[PDB]
Design a protein around this ligand. Structure first.
Ligand SMILES: CCCCCCCCCCCCCCCCCC(=O)OC[C@H](COP(=O)([O-])OCC(O)COP(=O)([O-])OC[C@@H](COC(=O)CCCCCCCCCCCCCCCCC)OC(=O)CCCCCCCCCCCCCCCCC)OC(=O)CCCCCCCCCCCCCCCCC
Ligand SMILES: CCCCCCCCCCCCCCCCCC(=O)OC[C@H](COP(=O)([O-])OCC(O)COP(=O)([O-])OC[C@@H](COC(=O)CCCCCCCCCCCCCCCCC)OC(=O)CCCCCCCCCCCCCCCCC)OC(=O)CCCCCCCCCCCCCCCCC
Ligand SMILES: CCCCCCCCCCCCCCCCCC(=O)OC[C@H](COP(=O)(O)OCCN)OC(=O)CCCCCCCCCCCCCCCCC
Ligand SMILES: CCCCCCCCCCCCCCCCCC(=O)OC[C@H](COP(=O)(O)OCCN)OC(=O)CCCCCCCCCCCCCCCCC
Ligand SMILES: CCCCCCCCCCCCCCCCCC(=O)OC[C@H](COP(=O)(O)OCCN)OC(=O)CCCCCCCCCCCCCCCCC
Ligand SMILES: CCCCCCCCCCCCO[C@@H]1O[C@H](CO)[C@@H](O[C@H]2O[C@H](CO)[C@@H](O)[C@H](O)[C@H]2O)[C@H](O)[C@H]1O
Ligand SMILES: CCCCCCCCCCCCO[C@@H]1O[C@H](CO)[C@@H](O[C@H]2O[C@H](CO)[C@@H](O)[C@H](O)[C@H]2O)[C@H](O)[C@H]1O
Ligand SMILES: CCCCCCCCCCCCO[C@@H]1O[C@H](CO)[C@@H](O[C@H]2O[C@H](CO)[C@@H](O)[C@H](O)[C@H]2O)[C@H](O)[C@H]1O
Ligand SMILES: CCCCCCCCCCCCO[C@@H]1O[C@H](CO)[C@@H](O[C@H]2O[C@H](CO)[C@@H](O)[C@H](O)[C@H]2O)[C@H](O)[C@H]1O
Lengths: 165, 51, 75, 98, 86, 126, 177, 459, 93, 55, 170
């Protein structure tokens, strides 16, 4: 009956995914980064009378907040050692030792892309309706972590510890 | 006007308050046009820089 | 056959939303038109150089007509 | 036991007035109380209060300070001066302990 | 799928029973008791309910399976479960 | 083979030795439990189906639980050696641990600023 | 779901329940219907075998042994019907099962769109009230003098009487609202 | 400020001289028009603070707080209107009077230019607040909550009065501008260490600091709705506002004296957040949520960096609107089932779909979803706390995870699952209850578009 | 609600055990207080540590989500054992 | 693919399938959910009540 | 418009199109149709507005702030002269925040346009950032939340002494 709320949420996810991918600074990344996190919660828990949907939705949130620590770790580091969150200014960090920020981004990518250690939440997200599974939890939301590390590739190229991990 | 007069209570308070602040200014003019930063010569028909 | 669907009383949630939007738009739309005609017609003050000798009024230090007008009268 | 009223029962606020707004038990006083909150709350404060805040100019000199920094960054670049000096106060004026 | 109607349920219940071997179709009516008029044992009636769940696509809990002892009782238990009223 | 239980993986009902007990003493336990269960279920239903009800059905079992877990803890608390040690460790244990992490870190930081051995290269906000 | 459980399962109930569980798990391993039919007949051979052993102290020891055998050859992931407990559709529509009493707060302008549904509803609310007194009375008359009680309920023993405590069963929301 | 104060003093005669059928309309209409006038304070086109007289003056720290106070008065009147409908007329007018009196004192408290004037006003707020919790509270425990609230404050506040007198007996004045422009470094002697605690413990209790916070969960769990709204939104921020104001004259002792209190806040906030996971009372879950947010505010003020102050000011305003919105929402259920147990009512989204939207938005503000100003505070406090030391990220990382759990667990428990269908008294949400939530949420959204207004003094 | 319908202090005598059991709707042979280490339990029943996932799913529980019945005593850690959280059900392995 | 065909075509044989540790591990997601989602939330939620709130 | 000295911008060097395929560039078509259907109607709407803004031409000025005595020229305790020295410094300190932003805009604006040659062709902007940062750190770093002129002066005197003690040995 509430089909056109379901349509609206999918639209909101798309917007929070286009915010994430075209962001020019870490803060606007975080709006999409956290926004798809919420939009996943509401769609995985579409059938909110089902107790296993609500547990799978809270489970997605819990793992993605464990990866928020990584994102926030990287954000504080750049605002302190580069005075900026913009990707242009972060580029002049190519000759620093970006272990701490790049560990943060690797943990955020680990949680957001369901990598080993933080992976259960992806098979559990299959509670939601199939259109949700196709859109979010396979072909957009889950590539955010991979997409993140592509943005910061100019830094990870000079770290063998991060590459090897 | 025996059950609607109460609407001058608060509007009167504002007017009385605005006037009470105009006095606080009149009391604190000891440095009017004397600061090292804004002191200037008085224009033709200018009696005070501010009121 | 079409069956009845038991629902919560939605009349009240819908009533609030309508009333909220009525009063927000009651002065918002007049304000918007007001703000839009002020930018279309009066325009924003241009930057100049203080001519030697002239002492600008305090309010002549802001661009927008709405801010210059508020500044001129109340402050 | 002691003399005491029984506990008053669970009333339905919509039973008698189906358009009850939440403010008063009397319908006429009730609607005008809803109307007042929406008018002074949304039409006046939120609309005009938001507008008055959007047109406060040069808020805390956030605008003047930029206009002034551009003037200084120009003047100093053409005249060969440093964009910004290391010392704030001139070393001439500072008599240090000997 | 199409709605379930009381006659369509009744037709599918008997249809499943007529393909059962230990039952003999010629003496199989809706009122046939499974333990008296057909001589089936406990361990069969369990398989009969299992065959109904597959037929209709939903489970009958064991607290209720052990009382469905005639085709009408099965038909009425399915009908009441799926909000079928004519 | 065989299944070894644990608190987070209990024993299945079908593997419970005490679930195939049939001696008459147990069967009478299991019949009084049902009678207590049915007596309450009957009372809940006599309120749920009542047409003159106009409010919800208050739950004494839930009132007792919430009261047992707040207003009734302290009166039923008696200091003992195990409580006092547990509160002392729980109370100041973590607080002392962190004090040395931060104090040690910031002393290494203040040491490295007096000898200039830090790279605050582009840092202008704090 | 409809029938309240007994105080305790009998031996007869504990063996039938196992039989059904053991077949459903077989079907989970076998998948293929021909292969599932073959082993399901072998399974019945193992239950017909000791069908008559009426020792009643080794029948039990034949059940605990067989449950401990089931628990080792479980399917780690048995098939579940979508609407059953643990099923993927289980409780999917519970967010669409509004209680009938929510209509008692409907605005009149809402009730004005279904004048004939809302007229066949005040009849049901009348029928519920007139019947209530006689329902409560019948439940005391059958309150057994010994406290021993069961969750079951009595029917209507008379004419013009609905069975006691019938409103929350008759009016319950549809399984697929 | 006398144009914000005098009209507010007139809501007291207006409360009493109005008709019985006009008291609630009249007062709540003029409260809005008073919070409009307080926007004049925002006309700050320069870097000089507004000094109106020898008594009052507004700063970028005292203006957001002043406005939040004035805007909250009309909100609390509407919140208190349905649970006071059974009281005779003089009790309603006596309740309205105690709420107005708390708005007048609070505005004078933030605009005061001298510490002694701040202290007296900062103590006067106990009277209307003690009367509210005790006279109009609901349970028998309201009597023990009034004592806990009254004497935690007073015990902390006596040393502050002593210390303020010592400051004046030595400096000659308590004016905040003069003490700023003539401040002398303190020696590290054992007497000044005590002067520091004397000047701080009063405000650290009101925050509250972890350890000495048991008054807050007691006060909230038993106050009427408007008691919790003012407590969680303004009275806690008296502590924060005081510490910022008086810590200028306490240097350099804050570089070491603060360690015990940075550690109680950083560790304490984890203890309080984890409590919200196992808290069986909904009004109690929010109150501990407040304790764990104020922990960051305490921690950030103790390190005195431009970012940390900026984050704390934003978090003060953000928490002011958010905690109040949560208390109003929990009250809306409570005014239907008269039970505070969180698990008693479930699946309420089925019958209150719109009120379930406000729940979601309040809950998302509480767990600091970007770009809300709740995150800006948490984020800028983290940035400063990282620079202070790098291992604070360990504790703030944890607290962020726990904050997500108890925020969503709050939403999942009460708004989802199956409906508790025996609750036939779940009436449709009142237009009044929904307006109350829109008034909390709209300003919060507007302040996100213009964060400049709540950056505080440093930025 | 009165003092004797509410939890109390640890039951010292068997006469105050059968009083406590009757309060909580339990059999006297089933009532079992927590051990008296003075950690604040008083006389609240100590019930087996089974999460609500183990309750009969097919029964029509009064509190449907919690899988409880009205009046039944509630485990001390219920909110840790609801179906959204910790599961203690038997595992195949 | 080739390995899959052979393996999936033994399921057509009238020979019963049995549990082994390797398929149990595969079917039960390496037991990572069955452990981590039981032990970890228990210890944390048990601390939330016994240590923080109560003690 | 904007001053091209505050915001330097290398001139654009677009190679002239060299189309050696028979096919039509679909970019160059939707660009024509975009100019006729989007660009042209909009420019009329803007030309209409600027003809109104010409009829009501108004002026505003940048405020001049003469220089007042420094903090160094203030007797201790004289709050009258400390207050003006403190206000001036806060104005100065704020203009320095905006200078830093301008120098950051350039570095960000260069990083984008140089693209794959930023490590080489963005040296001058990275050098001004590295220099104007050292000055900023030498003026304002570690002052704290309650920063003021007197702390700025105390920090400078403590640094002029730590450097004088460099040559007093060397
Ligand atoms: C439209 C709805 C209202 C829009 C308002 C937008 C938000 C307002 C923000 C607050 C601003 C308050 C303010 O202006 O104070 C400064 C201003 C200062 O007064 P002042 O002390 O006389 O002048 C001192 C100035 O420094 C210098 O003043 P001056 O000499 O330049 O001006 C002459 C002044 C000299 O006297 O005369 C007056 O007294 C007036 O206050 C006023 O004069 C009040 C102006 C009237 C504002 C009323 C706003 C509330 C009523 C509107 C709601 C009613 C709706 C229901 C119908
Ligand atoms: C106020 C005047 C506007 C009129 C509002 C209105 O009429 O709404 C009627 C509309 C339809 O009427 P309805 O059938 O009664 O819906 C209520 C249902 O019960 C259920 O309502 P609903 O759940 O279908 O819609 C509520 C919606 C929440 O409201 C929304 O519609 C989403 C709009 C975004 C906020 O819920 C959400 O989906 C939460 C979205 C979380 C956003 C996550 C991403 C945030 C980061 C991106 C934002 C920052 C971008 C910066 C760029 C860089 O309902 C609503 O929009 C909710 C009314 C309350 C307003 C929500 C806040 C927006 C203001
Ligand atoms: C970091 C430590 C954080 C620990 C979390 C403590 C707070 C958790 C509170 C909420 C716990 C909870 O709600 O648990 C319920 C949920 C059960 O999910 P599940 O059992 O898999 O669903 C089956 C349904 N048929 O359980 C969950 O889904 C939540 C998952 C908890 C485990 C998260 C651990 C993070 C990863 C750390 C290990 C990394 C190994 C490399
Ligand atoms: C000078 C300020 C404005 C004076 C006029 C304010 C009073 C307006 C008249 C009034 O009292 O409103 C009556 C209304 C409901 O009361 P009632 O008399 O029963 O109306 C019956 C209509 N069928 O109740 C109301 O609506 C009272 C609303 C009063 C709100 C104060 C308005 C202040 C205006 C800014 C100054
Ligand atoms: C559409 C929203 C909108 O109007 O946005 C425009 C404006 C933001 O523009 P602005 O920040 O001034 O630009 C600076 C450089 N970009 O946005 C604004 O300026 C609107 C600011 C809203 C101000 C609040 C209005 C009063 C509401 C009652 C206050 C209650 C909250 C108490 C906290 C007060 C703290 C100030
Ligand atoms: C808070 C709610 C918002 C309320 C805001 C109301 C703002 C009103 C804006 C209107 C401003 C009018 O401000 C006006 O600007 C015009 C330019 O058009 C200037 O006016 C000047 O030029 C015009 C051009 O014809 C001449 O007619 C006029 O005699 C001369 O003074 C002045 O600067 C001022 O008189
Ligand atoms: C600094 C802020 C100012 C603080 C001001 C202090 C206000 C007084 C607080 C103490 C409470 C006054 O005490 C209050 O007295 C009124 C009438 O006087 C009583 O009022 C109630 O009871 C009496 C009879 O019992 C009736 O006459 C009255 O109409 C009814 O409403 C309240 O039940 C009581 O709570
Ligand atoms: C670091 C500075 C902070 C210092 C803070 C000190 C605050 C002092 C608060 C005074 C509290 C007085 O506490 C007073 O006695 C107890 C405290 O349990 C409460 O009494 C409560 O518990 C006691 C148990 O001892 C029971 O007997 C009583 O029935 C119950 O109500 C009283 O209702 C309260 O009036
Ligand atoms: C539990 C409550 C805690 C109480 C906290 C009260 C605040 C603590 C105040 C600091 C301690 C007293 O601070 C005291 O100040 C006085 C003057 O004021 C000075 O003490 C001295 O004063 C003058 C010189 O100034 C001498 O003549 C005198 O003999 C001696 O008392 C020292 O500075 C310090 O001894």
């Amino acid at each position: 009956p509430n089909i056109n709320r379901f349509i609206k949420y999918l639209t909101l996810f798309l917007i929070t995914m286009l915010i994430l991918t075209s962001a020019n600074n870490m803060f606007q990344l975080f709006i999409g980064w956290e926004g798809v996190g919420i939009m996943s919660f509401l769609l995985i828990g579409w059938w909110y009378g089902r107790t296993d949907a609500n547990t799978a939705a809270l489970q997605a949130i819990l793992y993605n907040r464990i990866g928020d620590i990584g994102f926030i770790l990287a954000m504080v580091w750049f605002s302190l050692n580069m005075n900026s969150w913009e990707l242009q200014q972060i580029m002049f960090s190519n000759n620093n030792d970006n272990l701490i920020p790049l560990m943060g981004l690797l943990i955020a990518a680990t949680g957001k892309s369901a990598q080993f250690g933080l992976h259960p939440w992806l098979p559990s997200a299959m509670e939601g309706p199939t259109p949700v599974s196709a859109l979010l939890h396979s072909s957009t939301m889950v590539v955010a972590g991979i997409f993140l590390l592509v943005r910061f590739h100019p830094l990870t190229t000079n770290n063998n510890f991060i590459l090897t991990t | 006007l025996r059950e609607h007069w109460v609407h001058i209570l608060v509007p009167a308070g504002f007017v009385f308050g605005c006037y009470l602040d105009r006095k606080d200014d009149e009391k604190l003019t000891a440095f009017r046009n004397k600061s090292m930063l804004f002191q200037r010569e008085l224009r033709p028909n200018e009696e005070v820089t501010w009121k | 056959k079409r069956l009845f669907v038991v629902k919560p009383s939605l009349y009240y949630d819908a009533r609030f939303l309508r009333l909220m939007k009525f009063y927000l738009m009651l002065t918002g739309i007049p304000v918007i038109i007001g703000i839009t005609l002020v930018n279309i017609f009066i325009g924003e003050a241009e930057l100049a150089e203080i001519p030697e000798g002239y002492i600008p009024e305090h309010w002549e230090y802001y661009k927008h007509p709405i801010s210059r007008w508020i500044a001129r009268n109340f402050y | 036991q002691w003399q005491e009223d029984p506990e008053p029962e669970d009333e339905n606020v919509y039973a008698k007035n189906p358009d009850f707004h939440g403010y008063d038990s009397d319908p006429v006083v009730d609607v005008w109380n809803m109307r007042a909150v929406f008018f002074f709350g949304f039409s006046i404060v939120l609309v005009f209060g938001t507008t008055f805040v959007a047109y406060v100019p040069d808020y805390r000199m956030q605008e003047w300070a930029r206009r002034e920094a551009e003037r200084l960054v120009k003047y100093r670049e053409v005249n060969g001066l440093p964009i910004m000096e290391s010392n704030y106060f001139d070393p001439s004026k500072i008599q240090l302990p000997e | 799928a199409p709605p379930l109607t009381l006659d369509g349920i009744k037709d599918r219940v008997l249809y499943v029973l007529k393909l059962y071997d230990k039952i003999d179709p010629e003496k199989l009516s809706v009122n046939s008791h499974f333990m008296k008029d057909l001589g089936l044992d406990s361990l069969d009636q369990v398989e009969i309910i299992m065959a109904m769940e597959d037929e209709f696509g939903f489970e009958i809990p064991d607290i209720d399976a052990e009382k469905l002892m005639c085709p009408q009782e099965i038909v009425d238990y399915i009908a009441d479960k799926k909000d079928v009223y004519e | 083979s065989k299944y070894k239980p644990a608190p987070l993986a209990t024993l299945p009902s079908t593997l419970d030795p005490a679930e195939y007990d049939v001696s008459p003493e147990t069967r009478r336990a299991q019949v009084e439990r049902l009678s207590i269960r049915a007596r309450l279920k009957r009372e809940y239903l006599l309120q749920y189906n009542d047409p003159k009800r106009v409010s919800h059905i208050e739950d004494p079992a839930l009132i007792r639980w919430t009261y047992a877990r707040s207003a009734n803890i302290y009166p039923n608390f008696r200091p003992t050696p195990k409580n006092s040690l547990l509160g002392a460790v729980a109370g100041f244990g973590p607080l002392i641990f962190w004090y040395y992490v931060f104090k040690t870190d910031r002393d290494r930081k203040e040491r490295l600023i007096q000898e200039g051995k830090l790279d605050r290269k582009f840092n202008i906000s704090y | 779901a409809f029938c309240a459980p007994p105080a305790y399962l009998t031996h007869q109930q504990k063996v039938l329940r196992l039989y059904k569980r053991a077949l459903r798990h077989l079907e989970s391993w076998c998948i293929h219907r021909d292969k599932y039919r073959y082993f399901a007949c072998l399974m019945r051979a193992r239950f017909e075998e000791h069908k008559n052993e009426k020792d009643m102290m080794r029948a039990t020891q034949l059940l605990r042994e067989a449950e401990e055998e089931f628990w080792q050859n479980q399917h780690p992931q048995p098939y579940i019907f979508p609407d059953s407990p643990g099923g993927t559709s289980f409780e999917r529509y519970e967010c669409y099962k509004v209680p009938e009493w929510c209509l008692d707060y409907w605005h009149p302008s809402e009730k004005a769109m279904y004048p004939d549904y809302f007229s066949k509803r005040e009849q049901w609310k009348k029928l519920r009230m007139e019947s209530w007194d006689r329902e409560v009375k019948q439940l005391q008359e059958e309150t057994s003098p010994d406290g021993i009680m069961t969750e079951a309920l009595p029917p209507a023993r008379r004419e013009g009487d609905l069975p006691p405590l019938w409103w929350h069963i008759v009016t319950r929301p549809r399984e697929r609202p | 400020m006398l144009k914000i104060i005098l009209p507010s003093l007139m809501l007291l005669p207006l409360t009493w001289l109005s008709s019985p059928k006009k008291t609630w309309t009249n007062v709540t209409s003029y409260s809005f028009l008073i919070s409009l006038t307080s926007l004049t304070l925002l006309w700050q086109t320069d870097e000089n603070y507004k000094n109106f007289s020898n008594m009052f003056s507004s700063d970028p720290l005292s203006t957001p707080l002043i406005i939040l106070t004035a805007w909250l008065l009309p909100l609390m009147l509407m919140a208190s209107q349905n649970h006071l409908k059974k009281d005779n007329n003089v009790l309603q007018k006596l309740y309205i009077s105690m709420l107005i009196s708390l708005q007048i004192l609070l505005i004078m408290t933030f605009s005061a230019t001298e510490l002694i004037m701040f202290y007296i006003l900062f103590e006067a707020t106990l009277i209307p607040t003690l009367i509210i919790i005790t006279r109009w509270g609901n349970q028998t425990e309201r009597l023990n909550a009034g004592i806990y609230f009254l004497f935690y404050t007073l015990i902390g506040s006596i040393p502050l009065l002593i210390a303020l007198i010592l400051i004046q007996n030595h400096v000659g004045t308590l004016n905040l501008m003069i003490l700023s422009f003539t401040t002398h470094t303190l020696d590290a002697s054992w007497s000044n260490n005590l002067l520091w605690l004397a000047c701080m413990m009063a405000f650290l209790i009101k925050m509250p600091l972890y350890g000495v916070h048991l008054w807050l969960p007691k006060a909230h769990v038993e106050a009427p709705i408007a008691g919790s709204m003012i407590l969680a939104a303004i009275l806690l921020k008296l502590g924060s506002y005081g510490m910022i104001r008086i810590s200028i004259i306490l240097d350099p002792l804050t570089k070491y004296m603060a360690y015990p209190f940075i550690l109680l806040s950083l560790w304490g906030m984890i203890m309080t957040s984890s409590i919200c996971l196992r808290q069986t009372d909904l009004k109690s879950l929010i109150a501990y949520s407040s304790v764990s947010h104020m922990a960051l505010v305490i921690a950030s003020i103790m390190i005195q960096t431009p970012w940390s102050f900026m984050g704390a000011t934003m978090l003060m305003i953000a928490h002011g609107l958010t905690s109040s919105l949560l208390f109003c929402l929990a009250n809306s259920n409570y005014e239907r089932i008269h039970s505070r147990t969180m698990i008693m009512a479930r699946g309420l989204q089925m019958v209150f779909p719109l009120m379930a939207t406000w729940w979601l938005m309040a809950s998302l503000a509480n767990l600091a979803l970007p770009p809300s100003i709740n995150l800006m505070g948490e984020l800028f406090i983290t940035m400063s706390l990282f620079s202070w030391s790098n291992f604070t990220i360990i504790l703030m990382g944890i607290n962020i995870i726990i904050t997500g759990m108890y925020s969503m667990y709050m939403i999942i428990t009460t708004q989802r699952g199956k409906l508790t269908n025996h609750m036939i008294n779940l009436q449709p949400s009142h237009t009044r209850e929904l307006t109350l939530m829109a008034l909390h949420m709209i300003p919060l959204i507007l302040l996100t578009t213009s964060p400049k207004l709540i950056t505080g003094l440093t930025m | 609600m009165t003092k004797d319908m509410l939890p109390g202090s640890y039951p010292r005598t068997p006469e105050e055990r059968a009083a406590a059991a009757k309060k909580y709707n339990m059999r006297v042979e089933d009532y079992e207080p927590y051990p008296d280490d003075g950690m604040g339990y008083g006389d609240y029943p100590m019930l087996p540590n089974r999460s609500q996932h183990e309750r009969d799913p097919w029964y029509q529980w009064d509190h449907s989500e919690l899988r409880m019945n009205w009046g039944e005593p509630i485990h001390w850690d219920l909110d840790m054992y609801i179906r959204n959280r910790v599961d203690t059900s038997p595992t195949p392995v | 693919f080739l390995i899959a065909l052979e393996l999936n075509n033994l399921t057509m044989k009238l020979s019963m399938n049995k549990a082994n540790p390797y398929s149990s591990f595969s079917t039960l997601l390496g037991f990572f959910p069955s452990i981590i989602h039981r032990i970890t939330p228990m210890k944390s939620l048990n601390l939330s009540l016994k240590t923080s709130l109560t003690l | 418009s904007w001053d091209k000295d505050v915001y330097p911008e290398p001139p654009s060097r677009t190679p002239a199109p060299s189309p050696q395929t028979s096919l039509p560039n679909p970019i160059t078509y939707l660009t024509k149709a975009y100019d006729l259907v989007v660009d042209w109607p909009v420019t009329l709407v803007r030309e209409f507005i600027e003809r109104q803004h010409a009829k009501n031409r108004t002026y505003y000025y940048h405020r001049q702030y003469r220089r007042v005595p420094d903090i160094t020229e203030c007797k201790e305790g004289d709050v009258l002269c400390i207050y003006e020295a403190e206000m001036q410094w806060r104005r100065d300190f704020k203009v320095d925040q905006e200078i830093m932003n301008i120098i950051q805009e350039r570095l960000k604006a260069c990083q984008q346009r140089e693209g794959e040659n930023y490590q080489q062709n963005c040296a001058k902007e990275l050098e001004q950032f590295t220099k104007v940062t050292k000055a900023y750190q030498d003026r304002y770093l570690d002052l704290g939340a309650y920063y003021s002129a007197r702390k700025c002066l105390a920090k400078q005197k403590q640094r002029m002494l730590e450097e004088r003690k460099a040559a007093r040995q060397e």
